[PDB]
Amino acid sequence: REIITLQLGQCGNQIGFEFWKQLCAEHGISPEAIVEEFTDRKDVFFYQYIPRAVLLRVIHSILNSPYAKLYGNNWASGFSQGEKIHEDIFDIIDREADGSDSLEGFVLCHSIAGTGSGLGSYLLERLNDRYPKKLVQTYSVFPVQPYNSLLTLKRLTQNADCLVVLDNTALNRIATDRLHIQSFSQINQLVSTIMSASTTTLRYPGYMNNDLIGLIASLIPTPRLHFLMTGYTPLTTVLDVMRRLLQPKNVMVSNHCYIAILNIIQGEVDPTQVHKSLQRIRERKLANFIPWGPASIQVALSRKSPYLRVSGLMMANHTSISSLFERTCRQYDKLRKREDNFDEMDTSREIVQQLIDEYHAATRPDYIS
Numbered sequence: 001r002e003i004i005t006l007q008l009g010q011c012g013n014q015i016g017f018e019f020w021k022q023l024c025a026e027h028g029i030s031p032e033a034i035v036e037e038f039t040d041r042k043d044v045f046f047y048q049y050i051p052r053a054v055l056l057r058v059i060h061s062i063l064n065s066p067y068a069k070l071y072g073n074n075w076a077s078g079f080s081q082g083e084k085i086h087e088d089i090f091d092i093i094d095r096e097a098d099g100s101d102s103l104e105g106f107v108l109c110h111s112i113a114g115t116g117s118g119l120g121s122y123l124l125e126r127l128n129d130r131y132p133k134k135l136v137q138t139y140s141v142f143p144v145q146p147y148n149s150l151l152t153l154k155r156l157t158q159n160a161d162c163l164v165v166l167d168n169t170a171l172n173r174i175a176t177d178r179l180h181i182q183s184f185s186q187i188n189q190l191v192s193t194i195m196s197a198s199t200t201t202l203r204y205p206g207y208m209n210n211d212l213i214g215l216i217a218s219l220i221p222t223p224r225l226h227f228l229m230t231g232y233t234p235l236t237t238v239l240d241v242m243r244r245l246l247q248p249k250n251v252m253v254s255n256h257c258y259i260a261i262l263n264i265i266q267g268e269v270d271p272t273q274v275h276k277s278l279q280r281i282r283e284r285k286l287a288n289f290i291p292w293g294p295a296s297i298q299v300a301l302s303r304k305s306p307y308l309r310v311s312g313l314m315m316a317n318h319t320s321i322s323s324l325f326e327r328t329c330r331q332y333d334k335l336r337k338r339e340d341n342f343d344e345m346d347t348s349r350e351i352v353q354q355l356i357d358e359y360h361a362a363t364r365p366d367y368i369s
């Protein structure tokens with residue numbers, strides 16, 4: 001099973017290039033796409049070595065980078081231009097798809113803030129049209145801006161079978177707090193770190209989580225609640241890691257309870273103390289769960305890249321994320337009363353209102369019906 005990734009817009013292209021840099025460094029692959037001498041399953045993201053990427057001005061910057069051997073501002077303009085070159089890009093996508101043995105998904109890295117937003121909208125629609133059996137995960141990055149953002153949310157709440165949010169505000173906050181920057185090229189480091197650590201269990205095989213469905217179907221219980229948040233504590237026992245992870249100081253997010261939690265530990269820790277960690281976490285009652293269905297926290301281990309200490313990442317399904325949408329929603333209303341049919345934006349507002357209502361109803365003991 002092979003995962004193909006797509007990079008749209010300046011932000012998406014930059015974060016994808018840095019992610020590929022990080023991943024090539026994790027393995028023994030020189031910038032010249034030649035394996036270095038110096039166990040790690042690398043077939044998923046690399047083709048025998050060339051990455052499975054589809055880039056769509058900064059391309060010249062990448063071509064001038066040492067890694068050359070490795071390959072307007074409106075939403076409506078982006079959508080129109082994406083409709084204009086449907087066949088041109090889809091020939092590339094189809095040749096790269098059918099060239100693969102068994103395709104699995106379509107990772108999409110883009111910022112919902114110019115042309116990237118509408119282009120990703122169009123691509124998501126067309127991929128939902130053509131390929132009906134391919135999971136679509138999206139590493140979308142959150143910031144006339146409210147218009148584009150809400151349109152992207154409208155297209156993402158029904159097409160993408162999963163989604164991971166990344167807000168530049170929280171990243172900048174963490175940068176000023178514990179990195180003391182005052183830049184794109186600095187927050188992108190942490191972004192690429194989180195991304196590389198996200199797909200750790202796919203490249204280093206373990207007891208469980210050998211496929212994307214193993215990561216998705218565990219967290220997302222219903223097809224609507226498919227927005228996740230990330231946490232990365234190392235910026236030592238597993239209990240300390242789990243206690244530092246659940247702190248709101250580290251989560252990349254600007255009653256309420258949890259739906260599903262997943263922990264990935266990349267250290268050489270003793271794997272016998274994890275059950276004690278979970279026992280004590282349940283004892284002290286540091287986190288709450290849904291009252292209707294039985295929801296638990298899952299933990300998995302892995303191995304750090306030997307060619308490159310204890311780290312850890314956390315993927316959560318928290319109902320608080322809806323708050324962010326509200327802000328956008330709010331701004332849209334503020335933008336709707338200040339200034340062919342202009343009805344698509346109204347439908348977008350309607351469906352995002354539906355989604356926020358569903359999130360707000362999810363935290364009730366009678367969420368069913």
Ligand SMILES: Nc1nc2c(ncn2[C@@H]2O[C@H](COP(=O)(O)OP(=O)(O)O)[C@@H](O)[C@H]2O)c(=O)[nH]1
Nearest residue numbers: 009010011014072111113114115116168184188
């Ligand atoms: N987190 C992050 N966001 C970025 C970076 N570069 C650009 N962005 C976002 O991308 C948006 C600009 O997109 P733009 O390049 O104009 O899209 P285009 O019109 O299709 O080229 C801004 O609102 C930024 O928030 C980056 O390095 N990191």
